[PDB]
Design a protein around this motif. Sequence first.
Motif, mmCIF file in Angstrom:
data_model
loop_
_atom_site.group_PDB
_atom_site.id
_atom_site.type_symbol
_atom_site.label_atom_id
_atom_site.label_comp_id
_atom_site.label_asym_id
_atom_site.label_seq_id
_atom_site.Cartn_x
_atom_site.Cartn_y
_atom_site.Cartn_z
ATOM 1 N N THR C 154 0.843 -1.186 0.203
ATOM 2 C CA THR C 154 0.015 0.006 -0.023
ATOM 3 C C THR C 154 0.873 1.253 -0.133
ATOM 4 O O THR C 154 0.747 2.296 -0.739
ATOM 5 C CB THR C 154 -0.817 0.153 1.182
ATOM 6 N N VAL C 155 1.875 1.065 0.551
ATOM 7 C CA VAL C 155 2.801 2.399 0.837
ATOM 8 C C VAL C 155 3.433 2.674 -0.683
ATOM 9 O O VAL C 155 3.481 3.696 -1.198
ATOM 10 C CB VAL C 155 4.057 2.046 1.751
ATOM 11 N N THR C 156 3.848 1.621 -1.377
ATOM 12 C CA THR C 156 4.497 1.552 -2.686
ATOM 13 C C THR C 156 3.261 1.951 -3.695
ATOM 14 O O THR C 156 3.748 2.869 -4.544
ATOM 15 C CB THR C 156 4.819 0.222 -3.228
ATOM 16 N N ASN C 157 2.116 1.608 -3.381
ATOM 17 C CA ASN C 157 0.979 2.060 -4.490
ATOM 18 C C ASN C 157 0.894 3.581 -4.180
ATOM 19 O O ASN C 157 0.583 4.213 -5.205
ATOM 20 C CB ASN C 157 -0.315 1.227 -4.213
ATOM 21 N N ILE C 158 0.669 4.006 -2.938
ATOM 22 C CA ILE C 158 0.287 5.372 -2.740
ATOM 23 C C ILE C 158 1.454 6.299 -3.283
ATOM 24 O O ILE C 158 1.299 7.536 -3.894
ATOM 25 C CB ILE C 158 0.158 5.619 -1.128
ATOM 26 N N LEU C 159 2.774 5.971 -2.944
ATOM 27 C CA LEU C 159 3.826 6.642 -3.626
ATOM 28 C C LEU C 159 3.958 6.598 -5.119
ATOM 29 O O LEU C 159 4.195 7.674 -5.728
ATOM 30 C CB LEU C 159 5.172 6.098 -3.133
ATOM 31 N N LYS C 160 3.511 5.677 -5.648
ATOM 32 C CA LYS C 160 3.425 5.456 -7.197
ATOM 33 C C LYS C 160 2.376 6.631 -7.824
ATOM 34 O O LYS C 160 2.561 7.156 -8.928
ATOM 35 C CB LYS C 160 3.168 3.992 -7.724
ATOM 36 N N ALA C 195 11.795 1.359 6.909
ATOM 37 C CA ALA C 195 12.241 0.062 6.809
ATOM 38 C C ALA C 195 12.858 -0.106 5.258
ATOM 39 O O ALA C 195 13.652 -0.808 5.072
ATOM 40 C CB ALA C 195 11.368 -0.923 7.243
ATOM 41 N N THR C 196 11.714 0.122 4.506
ATOM 42 C CA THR C 196 12.158 -0.042 3.090
ATOM 43 C C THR C 196 13.014 1.017 2.294
ATOM 44 O O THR C 196 13.670 0.741 1.339
ATOM 45 C CB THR C 196 10.966 -0.004 2.085
ATOM 46 N N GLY C 197 13.400 1.944 3.195
ATOM 47 C CA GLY C 197 14.389 2.835 2.820
ATOM 48 C C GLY C 197 13.938 3.792 1.531
ATOM 49 O O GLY C 197 14.866 4.201 0.693
ATOM 50 N N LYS C 198 12.601 4.302 1.565
ATOM 51 C CA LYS C 198 12.225 5.112 0.437
ATOM 52 C C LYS C 198 11.187 6.447 1.134
ATOM 53 O O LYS C 198 10.679 6.843 0.282
ATOM 54 C CB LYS C 198 11.388 4.422 -0.376
ATOM 55 N N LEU C 199 11.799 6.588 2.173
ATOM 56 C CA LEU C 199 11.080 7.901 2.911
ATOM 57 C C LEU C 199 11.647 8.927 2.337
ATOM 58 O O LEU C 199 10.714 10.192 2.484
ATOM 59 C CB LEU C 199 11.409 7.731 4.446
ATOM 60 N N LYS C 200 12.697 9.109 1.867
ATOM 61 C CA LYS C 200 13.227 10.654 1.373
ATOM 62 C C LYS C 200 12.218 11.095 0.263
ATOM 63 O O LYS C 200 11.858 12.131 0.038
ATOM 64 C CB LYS C 200 14.613 10.349 0.745
ATOM 65 N N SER C 201 11.876 10.329 -0.867
ATOM 66 C CA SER C 201 11.010 10.580 -1.934
ATOM 67 C C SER C 201 9.605 10.794 -1.473
ATOM 68 O O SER C 201 8.862 11.671 -1.966
ATOM 69 C CB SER C 201 10.873 9.521 -2.929
ATOM 70 N N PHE C 202 9.168 9.926 -0.428
ATOM 71 C CA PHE C 202 7.894 10.301 0.231
ATOM 72 C C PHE C 202 7.751 11.732 0.782
ATOM 73 O O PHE C 202 6.769 12.545 0.643
ATOM 74 C CB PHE C 202 7.747 9.258 1.321
ATOM 75 N N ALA C 203 8.711 12.049 1.459
ATOM 76 C CA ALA C 203 8.847 13.585 2.077
ATOM 77 C C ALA C 203 8.867 14.571 1.161
ATOM 78 O O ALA C 203 8.476 15.731 1.197
ATOM 79 C CB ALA C 203 9.828 13.552 3.238
#
Lengths: 274, 476, 670, 116
Positions: C154-160, C195-203
């Motif tokens: 779900t995190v990946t989908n929302i980021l996408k 944990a996945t190490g993708k928070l930078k692009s999220f922020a």
Amino acid sequence: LKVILEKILTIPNTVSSAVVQQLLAAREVIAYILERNACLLPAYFAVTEIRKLYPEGKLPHWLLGNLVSDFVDTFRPTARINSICGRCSLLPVVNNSGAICNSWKLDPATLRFPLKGLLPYDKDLFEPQTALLRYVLEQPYSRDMVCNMLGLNKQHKQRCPVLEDQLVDLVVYAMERSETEEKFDDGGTSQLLWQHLSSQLIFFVLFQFASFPHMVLSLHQKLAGRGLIKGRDHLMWVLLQFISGSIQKNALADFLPVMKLFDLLYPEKEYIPV
Amino acid sequence: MMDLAYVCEWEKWSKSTHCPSVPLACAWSCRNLIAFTMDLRSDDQDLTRMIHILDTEHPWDLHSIPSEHHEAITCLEWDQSGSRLLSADADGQIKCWSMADHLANSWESSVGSLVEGDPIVALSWLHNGVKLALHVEKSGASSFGEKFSRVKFSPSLTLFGGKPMEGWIAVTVSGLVTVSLLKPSGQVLTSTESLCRLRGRVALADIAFTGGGNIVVATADGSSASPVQFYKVCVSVVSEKCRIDTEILPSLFMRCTTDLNRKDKFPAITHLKFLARDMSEQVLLCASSQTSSIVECWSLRKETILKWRILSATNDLDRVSAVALPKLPISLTNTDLKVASDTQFYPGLGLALAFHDGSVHIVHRLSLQTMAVFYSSVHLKAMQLSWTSLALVGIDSHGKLSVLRLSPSMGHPLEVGLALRHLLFLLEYCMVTGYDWWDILLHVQPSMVQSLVEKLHEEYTRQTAALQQVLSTRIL
Amino acid sequence: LLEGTMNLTGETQSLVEQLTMVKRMQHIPTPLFVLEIWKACFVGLIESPEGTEELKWTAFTFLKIPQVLVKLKKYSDFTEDVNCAFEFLLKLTPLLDKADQRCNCDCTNFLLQECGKQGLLSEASVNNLMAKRKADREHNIQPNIQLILRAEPTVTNILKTMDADHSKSPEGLLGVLGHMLSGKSLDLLLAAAAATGKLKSFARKFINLNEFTTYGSEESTKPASVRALLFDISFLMLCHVAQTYGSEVILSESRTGAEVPFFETWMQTCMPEEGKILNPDHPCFRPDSTKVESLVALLNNSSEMKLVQMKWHEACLSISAAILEILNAWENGVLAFESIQKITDNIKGKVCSLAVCAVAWLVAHVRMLGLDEREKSLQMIRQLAGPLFSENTLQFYNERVVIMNSILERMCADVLQQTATQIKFPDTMPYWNLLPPKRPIKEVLTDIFAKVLEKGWVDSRSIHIFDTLLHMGGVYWFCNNLIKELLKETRKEHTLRAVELLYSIFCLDMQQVTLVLLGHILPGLLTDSSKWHSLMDPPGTALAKLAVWCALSSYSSASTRQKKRHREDIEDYISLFPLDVNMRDPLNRVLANLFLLISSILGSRTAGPHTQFVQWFMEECVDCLEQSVLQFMPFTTVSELVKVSKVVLAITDLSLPLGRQVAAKAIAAL
Amino acid sequence: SIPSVLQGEVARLDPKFLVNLDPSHCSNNGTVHLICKLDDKDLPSVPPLELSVPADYPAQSPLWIDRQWQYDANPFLQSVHRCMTSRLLQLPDKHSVTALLNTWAQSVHQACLSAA
């Protein structure tokens, strides 16, 4: 082995090195002796003689080196076989029937468990066991139990000091407890505690296992600056029991520091109401 | 004429190897006695933990006190009368050294205080409460009382009347303060307390006194981006110990960071000083980068009710390694500046600064302006001035000691009469007090000795029948 | 445990290289390595207190370590080693039972399935281990493990799908933001991203959306309310991210041009964090003089009602000077209490970010102010953060006020501690203000070191206490005290385990501690004429092993607090080491000085325990190296070691062009 | 370093010997190590016969480091060795190094004479 080790101990802790290669011959001799493969002698003898020379907590000579230290480490497993798990936290139930078991006895000199052999035992078995006798003393009717486990025989004057130190620690702990709240309950397990504390003390000091002036000075030192003044009246009651008990037997001086104590424990300038 | 008096060095002290640099300390007493410590690291650690006692009259022979300290000595302080020395280092161990058999070549200590594990960053004696004010305008007033006027500060911790109590106060690396008091007997009373609930790094600290019996302590973290906190302290002996009451005072923020042109420079604070002890209304700050430095002054004058403002700031300075403050109590009144400017009389308007070069600067007090520059032909790590400020002692990054002659004229020519008046006015200060006059003798010319002697002879006379009775030995 | 405690957001490459470096430093079999890793992960999971820390620990131990194992596979036979480590781990029944009963689910099955997905374990072995675990175990609320494992996609989908702003549909944006604004959803998404190490692009994406939405455009009342809600929710998420996962992820650290986001400037200059104290009179707090007057007039007139287009950024910059003016007038006594009540009601009525910025500025101003005048501001501060305000909410108030209360708690507790004040905004901060207020730090340091040595492992609370003690005391004091505590052991096992624990303890900031050690403590102990009485055989060997470990580990080349610490202070290393490749790196200079000292000591006269110490140092230096810190070693010590008494030569020669003949001459004359 | 007595006695020896410092072992201490070579036209070549000199050389005697394997595997060399052992047992106490060197030369000469 004994004589060679004792002779090597005479070398100074700092010497030149142009001679140390001439001095390593004793190390070679000892290395041959301490080998468990050729079986010159049982290793138990070697380890017990080394421990007789070096007690625990003392470092070996700088010339012998790891050759000695690693040796005693090889006796680590066997010492684990002869150790009871959780020995320090075992607590009995106090009774006056006598017939003491030998498993509860302590060292009169330093309050340690009597250990069989000179094996490299666990660390926890070499610290003083202050909890066991603290629990024993706190229980009522624990009179012969303490003297039995400390080796006292109540027929000869001994003046045992560690008993005095433990008694002083118990009195100051009781003072802190009486300082804590003393408000939830009118009794609060205090008056009976003070009576027992006072009652047992009268027994210990009458047979001269403890010294009165020394106890008073020790109490003054412990309470110096601690600022625990809420149940000082009970301590003065215990001191009244002290003085009134044996005023005729001894001289006036034995009661000199009480004056300092009264002043210290009672810092005031205004009158005390009735 | 700013000059060099004499350079003292010791053989075999140099040529150290594998020796990391360590900060040093220096102390000048009322009598011409120097107490210091020097980085040696020569085949023994204790040579870096010894107290060197020097007498300026005989520089060649030096006394070594083998202090039993375990870490590098931080600070050294003399008493109001130079009869005892206070020394402190890391890991507690504050010692009070006393003179043995009234001999300056033998010292022994029996009084001390200790806090375990906390290095001491600030240390000071308690105040006695007597100071004087000197007026150069009335140098010809022909009256000792008219010249040196009593200022009447108040003493701290007065017991059984007007007699002060002696002791010391120290501030550790953390927010921890310790206070010690001395009974008339050998008894000592010690106490410790926490400054405030905000416990953090206190890299720099300073202590000052105020009128009324209050202590001002200044703490600086040293990041140049955090405020410098100020606290007020009162000490009271409630019948068994010295209790400490502390409260917060308004703080300030560093300058030269809102310039919005180049703020990345000067990222660390290296020196925090009080302009004068018992003068808590002025604070000197000195920050430095790896190359350059800035020095600023702030005050707490009344325009919140209390605010800190900016007084002066130098253009550009090299790396700052040593700062020294004057000890002469100038009156600092408006009417005295004009008469101290027209006449070449600058004994208390100078602050001494050293850099990582062989350059030593004397900068004006109120406004930071340079007036005297000295080149040595290496850098100076620790240095001090004198009561009359006629000379300064300095320790370089070697085994050398230096003594430099500071003249009131600072190169400006003057007539004989003005020089004679200056010298006699300075000598009368040492006449009233018990201080020595070696630095004054450093500057007297052989030609005008007779005039000084005779004029001092008539100065001795025509006193009010009481000063002559107690000054015969000193006048002789 | 140290890596899982603090820097859970760091790149896994550093963790992998550190683990391989530790494995090479001391010979460790692979099954023991994997078993120790799994046991450490589980024991760290169990001791975690209830809250967001438990979620973070579960996410770490069930997401991040599979990539570490995959990278170990790639860099490096491994499969049977993993199976053997797992069969070791399966023997421990009570630990697994406690972990299972804490998480209310069979975590072993989920871990086995997760590692099977990565392909580390074969299918037949997975089935056999599952059967064994079920046999051993034979003796409606969804658990957080399944929630994390099902919400990371779900995190990946929302980021996408958020990059296109859902085809520019604001109503769908409100729907999706409200869906993730429910119970613990934001925390789960943040933990999965970290944990996945993708928070930078999220922020980065939320910052871009906020920058788009602050300026806005002309809209009617409903879309204007939509825009205001978007702005408020984005501000709340960014503030929560800043206050939860540090100050490193939101800041870009790579920005070209002057079009920097305003939120980055506000973050750098307006939020008090654990490592920064603000200046209330900074130029950023004085934008203008007319905008603030317009804002105060709007505040004192009525509800704003102008939120169709309001220039949220300039307004937010203006509340600081506005509330300055209101507080000054209020202290002047010309304004009544009810007027302040009306102003606070207007602030907390519709938009909640204004209250946050006002509280931040009030805290920044109060910090400088004196004791006798601070009490005036705290009452209006707590009025700004009083009970929830009703009859003015648009929608979605519960989690909004909850996150606002949490943010203000974490922002104001620092000043609330200084005074005797309590507001009770209703834990979210179990590790805060741990050390005793009055007693010295050496006592607690020694007690905690003794407890860690006795237990045999390090706890996370002990890690935090060590971190704050290192911050307060300094590197030299810390290292000297710990080494002094080391030298009091007379048993070889105790000093061995002490060195093993102290290596991981010093792993907080390896470069500074190794520099301080090798430049100040070892030469001091080696030069003084009364200090080698403590350099006996067990502690000497243990300290030599620790020293060589630290030296070569630092030569081979970990917190924000230590980052600011070593960026704060300078040190002229040229003057420190006169020295009788680059010669500018302090490590090279200090190691060359150490080698010169060791050569001088070895070649000196009247040899004692120090020569044995340097012999041990050289021996372990030869042993540890794979073939490299021996380039700076002098050429004379090759003959000196032979003089004082093979393989200890060829490795040390380094095959220098001078080295060939010096080695031939040395080995020839035996 | 090297005491003056050793330097003087080396300066005042017959030019049949060119003794010098040992390339191996320690130096600049009370105990020094010397290696010897014999250059005599009338005598053959023999093992170097190195020596060790302890500290405070006067009022004591130096010692000779025996190397049995070097002198073996040849009747001439072991005859030299047994004559060497005999002569060093015949030497009195407090002897010097020049006496030992002359004893070496004379033992080699006697062994050569006995051989032929």
